[PDB]
Structures are given as C-alpha cells and as structure tokens.
Enzyme design. Structure first.
Site, short mmCIF file in Angstrom:
data_model
loop_
_atom_site.label_atom_id
_atom_site.label_comp_id
_atom_site.label_asym_id
_atom_site.label_seq_id
_atom_site.Cartn_x
_atom_site.Cartn_y
_atom_site.Cartn_z
N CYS A 36 0.36 11.24 -2.17
CA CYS A 36 0.61 10.19 -1.18
C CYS A 36 1.81 9.36 -1.60
O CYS A 36 1.71 8.58 -2.56
CB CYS A 36 -0.62 9.28 -1.09
SG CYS A 36 -0.38 7.89 0.02
N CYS A 39 1.45 5.41 -1.18
CA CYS A 39 0.49 4.96 -2.23
C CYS A 39 1.19 4.66 -3.56
O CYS A 39 0.90 3.66 -4.20
CB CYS A 39 -0.57 6.03 -2.48
SG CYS A 39 -1.49 6.49 -0.99
#
Ligand SMILES: [Zn+2]
Ligand SMILES: [Zn+2]
Ligand SMILES: [Zn+2]
Length: 109
Positions: A36, A39
């Site tokens: 991700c 993230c």
C-alpha cells in the site's frame, strides 16, 4: 525531553485485537498493507502521533496477515485508521490525510 519512546505495535492475532480495543482509553489502529503506497506515505505521521499522544495506545495491522480482522471491521480503503474506546469504534478515518487523522485523535484522546 525524549527520554523514552512509544511504539506503534503490530497486532499478531484477532484475539489480541479484541482485547486491546476493550480498554477504557483511546486505542488507534492503523490498517495497512506492505503493497500500500499511501500507507507508507502516512506511516511517519502515525509514528509521531504515537509519541504526541502518550495517553492513547497505538497499533498497526497488516491486512495481508489479519485480513479477517479487516473484514469484520469493514475496512476497504487503505489506509484506514480506526479509533476505539471501551470496545467501540469512535472514528474511521479513510485515506492518507494526516490532518483528518490528527483531528480524530485529538477529538478522542
Ligand atoms: Zn527531561
Ligand atoms: Zn521516541
Ligand atoms: Zn511518553
């Protein structure tokens, strides 16, 4: 005066998740994945918040490891920051805006 640290602790199992959020205090959970991108972009902010709000407990959860916990908590967008107090979800901040995450922690700490 950085004489000690606070950590963002990684959950290992669903049962540790369940017990951790039962507490009578703000518990912040960063749902992420190693794949991700956003993230990783917000990871630094979350680490800093953990040491800015020592009265809250901070955790992270790898949805590749605990996708089950993610499913029960209806996490879809990534990152998702879930905040709990006394066993109940009190915020669900979706996406990578550090400002919203900061507002939510400040609201609930
Ligand atoms: Zn000192
Ligand atoms: Zn530190
Ligand atoms: Zn401290």
């Amino acid at each position: 005066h950085h004489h000690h640290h606070h950590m963002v602790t990684q959950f290992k199992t669903a049962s540790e998740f369940d017990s951790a959020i039962a507490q009578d205090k703000l518990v912040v959970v960063d749902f992420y994945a190693t794949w991700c991108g956003p993230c990783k972009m917000i990871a630094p902010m979350i680490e800093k918040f953990s040491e800015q709000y020592p009265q809250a407990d901070f955790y992270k959860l790898d949805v590749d490891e605990l996708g089950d916990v993610a499913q029960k908590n209806e996490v879809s967008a990534m990152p998702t920051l879930l905040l709990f107090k006394n066993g109940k979800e009190v915020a669900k901040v979706v996406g990578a805006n550090p400002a919203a995450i900061k507002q939510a922690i400040a609201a609930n700490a």
